Amino acid sequence: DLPKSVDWRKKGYVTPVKNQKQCGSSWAFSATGALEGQMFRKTGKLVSLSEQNLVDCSRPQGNQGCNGGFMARAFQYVKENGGLDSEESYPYVAVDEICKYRPENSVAQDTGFTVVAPGKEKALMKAVATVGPISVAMDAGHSSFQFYKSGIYFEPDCSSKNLDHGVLVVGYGFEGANSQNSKYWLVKNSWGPEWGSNGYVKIAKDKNNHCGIATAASYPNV
């Protein structure tokens, strides 16, 4: 059955927290985070992937670089493109630039992606427990989120349907000795390690799909 808690950071699947800066590229960080987890599961090597490669090259698939995008379109680009470059070979500069994809520097691939369906928290829990980190969209458009520091985040103004930010669910847990209450999703953000709880946020779990975390979740197939 499903584990009481999961934290893929403790298993080597997750890279250190990154910073998208003033570019609307959270979708690219969410997609490289999911791909980093799946490549690690497949090869045993954790290699940081290039968000800039996605920002600069995936316009044909429907992404708009620093003006926004979608994780599923990014996984589609990696499939059609045949690869994705490492973060070291194609560094992040937080502005839209010319596509400079280099096949010789590719370190990741995908054949498509799987959508978490239904858009229910229990389905997301199954996906997190069996696959690894999962890309998700959420409603991060709140001052309370910008100033979040620690604890379980809950915001009455949060929408489960109108989402504006891509993040990565790396696990789930609970506070205390009881696994069924004070539950939370472990979410990796892309605002730097100085934001939030070391770059992470605990989003309330089993509180009616709070902030939309299970509404548009997906992961690459590697």
């Binding site: 309370s144 979040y148 520091k149 604890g151 379980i152 985040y153």
Partner: peptide
């Protein structure tokens, strides 16, 4: 509940 910065 949850804490805010600093």
């Amino acid at each position: 509940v949850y804490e805010k910065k600093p």
